Symmetry: D2
Subunit: 235 residues, 4 copies
Amino acid sequence: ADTIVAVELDTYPNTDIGDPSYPHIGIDIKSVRSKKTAKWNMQNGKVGTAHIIYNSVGKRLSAVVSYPNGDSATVSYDVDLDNVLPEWVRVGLSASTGLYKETNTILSWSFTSKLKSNSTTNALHFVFNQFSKDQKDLILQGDATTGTDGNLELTRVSSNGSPQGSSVGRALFYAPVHIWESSAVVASFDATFTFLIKSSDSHPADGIAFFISNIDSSIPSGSTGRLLGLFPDAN
Amino acid sequence: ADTIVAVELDTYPNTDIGDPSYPHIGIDIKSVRSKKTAKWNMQNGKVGTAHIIYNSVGKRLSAVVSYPNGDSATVSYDVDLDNVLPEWVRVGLSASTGLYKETNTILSWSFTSKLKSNSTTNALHFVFNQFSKDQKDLILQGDATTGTDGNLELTRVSSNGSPQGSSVGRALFYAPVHIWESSAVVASFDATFTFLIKSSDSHPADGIAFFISNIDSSIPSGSTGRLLGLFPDAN
Amino acid sequence: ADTIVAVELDTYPNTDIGDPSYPHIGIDIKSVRSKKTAKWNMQNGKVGTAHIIYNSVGKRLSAVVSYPNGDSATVSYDVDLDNVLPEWVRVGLSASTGLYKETNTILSWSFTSKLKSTNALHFVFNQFSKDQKDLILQGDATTGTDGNLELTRVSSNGSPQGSSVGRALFYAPVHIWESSAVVASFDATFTFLIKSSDSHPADGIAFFISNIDSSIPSGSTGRLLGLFPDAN
Amino acid sequence: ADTIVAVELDTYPNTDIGDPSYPHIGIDIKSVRSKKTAKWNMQNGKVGTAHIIYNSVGKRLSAVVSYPNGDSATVSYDVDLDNVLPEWVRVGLSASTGLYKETNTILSWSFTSKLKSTNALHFVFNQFSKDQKDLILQGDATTGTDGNLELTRVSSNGSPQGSSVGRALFYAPVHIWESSAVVASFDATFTFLIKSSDSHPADGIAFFISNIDSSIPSGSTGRLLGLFPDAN
Ligand SMILES: O=C(O)COc1ccc(Cl)cc1Cl
Ligand SMILES: O=C(O)COc1ccc(Cl)cc1Cl
Ligand SMILES: [Ca+2]
Ligand SMILES: [Ca+2]
Ligand SMILES: [Ca+2]
Ligand SMILES: [Ca+2]
Ligand SMILES: [Cl-]
Ligand SMILES: [Cl-]
Ligand SMILES: [Cl-]
Ligand SMILES: [Cl-]
Ligand SMILES: [Cl-]
Ligand SMILES: [Cl-]
Ligand SMILES: [Cl-]
Ligand SMILES: [Cl-]
Ligand SMILES: [Mn+2]
Ligand SMILES: [Mn+2]
Ligand SMILES: [Mn+2]
Ligand SMILES: [Mn+2]
């Protein structure tokens, strides 16, 4: 199976598999059953921003999701990712729908990774504030598409604009990322994305995640719905 | 009194005032008596590197000090600096000597502060990899000088190069820094400096600190030696 | 007198002192009579963006001003700024009104200077604060609670006032060149909103680089854009 | 054929194909016969640094190569690279030897591309890894355990070999221009160590920008620097 570290924006409470009974942000270490969650008020049709932060000194993976009116949710988890991730990874965004559905629109995405030693460094930084129709530095998987409106649609949307159910899609940056290296004194990464989740359903579902995977990661078969395109099962 | 948050590279164990019985790196929140320390092997005459990291999501102030042979010490402390620091600060480097002495030479210093909200930001970044004789964007205090060798000598050195006792000096960046702001979702800062501590004494003393202070901070009277130019007393 | 290098966004043609007969962007080296200009269609009430670029290798000072519909004006001038500026400088934004007027609202400003062989300064304001401790405000310039920097005076009911001048300078001096550096470069970007109900908007906005102790020259409202004591 | 824009650090004068009669730095636009050159004193066994700078406003491609004693050579060429390069590219380093030889050791490489109206790519290698998954190595190029990138072949006892050619390309394609961008800029820096015990060092190192599927052209050792199929 793939190795997955992720931050989930989980719009649907699947209490059968350990979700809390409300929409939530979560930290996922090799399981869709978050090691840590926090209550999250997803604002239907509003543009939200997620920030994800980690470094090898503090060994704490932190995330905050916020909307323009000021409401925010935060979750942190203490973990040494050196003991979890392979040395080389790809980084990506994933989203899904199931019996319920929502747009999983990404308006922007930035990422920075640094390996530091004895000086004021190896580094990778990319930022997309507009996506292109043929975005050659992104690997799209599943239902994910980039449009001429400058956005990344992780899950399927109809020609009339409406989201579709039982959809799953992901976008990974093209280059592998050197996420740790034994001679480095500091390894850090940061990610930010902005998103627009909109639904006319009885309940929106399923959510968006930022994830870090093995370089050859692919969408697990059957990972629509509650598995967020990240995991083959709810274990 | 000034308000001080600092990371100390403490070369002399002052066990009377709560130092551990070995050289150490420490996190100082409004007291020279560190809230958290870790054992540190200072390598006499070698160039070391210190990295300091904080963000308002994880609320953990982390530091690591390392030398070219690979040895490193790390300390982290959980603290919400919003409840400690004023909104506007200056950032700086400080060092002292006492009855024992050492060179407190800074070879480079970088700093980044960011205030983020709902997007992929206000920011300040500076880096000095060489200091100038007349370094107009630095406020020097006490015995601190910049040379034509490209370094910052925080404490006094004789014409023959040898360090002097009972010395104290500091360098602050000229512009005030907006270290937190209530509408920001993320406030983060990072600092890195490289240093060369060298001594022929029976024991080196006293150490170097990176600090964040009120904008009008000055060297407390009598803060040579164990007080590291940061504090008026050992309380 | 001060030493001034500036990029001007000149909304009012003063053909009396060398302006072309249209609004224009210009490169100003120690005089308000631009060394190089390009025609500029200022879009009243729209948010524009100015990008300014220089490096000591190419020794070209370049600027472009653009609006969201894509219309843009560009101007470039070959100059070795080592021969013009003091080693240490301050960097700033300036604007003026005169007999005609406009808002000179800055929504964001960023700046980067590097000396490589690296020393570097970078700041970004995407929202300004009411009491902006790392800005030196001169003349009529204020920062509000709307996150913007108003370079010239605006009345309580929101409207711009005439014969106004104001500037904002970054607090720290900047080391703009150093003889041992292989590359000295700088870049600046700002976004602005110029709005006018006048018969003609005037006078404009500039990004400028000055001696560290620069102050608004006496009488520099109107066509002198808060930068120069005279039209020489 | 490939489409190539390059900055060459040319250690061997091939006056037969248009080189000046001295080692030189040159700007190459779709041909090995540089559009612009400048005399260059390569310092055998010393670590040098190359800085390359371009932006779509000034439309000047500039480069400087320098050593720690301060000696430097600079070359600039006015060109609109929108008219030359494909929208998407890969960026890389290339080097060759021929009948004379040298080490073509890269100690560090950084690159930044930005499209503003911002999209951006930045990478920095200050130490290379043995299995460098974000580099595409072509020809004789290898990465070691000493943290360096060896573009041409070196023998087990450390010495450079003749008629060798190798390149390293960053794994991700780069969006080097986009029609809606107001500013498209890129910058690259690399540090290198060219060492030779030969009667003359040869042939040199280049930073280059190519079509995304670029490969070493057949026969491009020696004076063609791994970039071009011929001297046209
Ligand atoms: O922050 C800055 O000053 C530079 O970023 C920008 C520049 C131009 C435009 Cl249109 C939008 C942005 Cl965010
Ligand atoms: O990392 C890079 O590629 C750029 O940084 C440098 C550039 C030139 C020199 Cl001499 C030294 C350094 Cl650290
Ligand atoms: Ca769920
Ligand atoms: Ca002590
Ligand atoms: Ca005018
Ligand atoms: Ca040649
Ligand atoms: Cl369920
Ligand atoms: Cl299952
Ligand atoms: Cl004691
Ligand atoms: Cl005391
Ligand atoms: Cl006139
Ligand atoms: Cl006059
Ligand atoms: Cl020849
Ligand atoms: Cl040929
Ligand atoms: Mn969940
Ligand atoms: Mn101590
Ligand atoms: Mn004019
Ligand atoms: Mn040549």
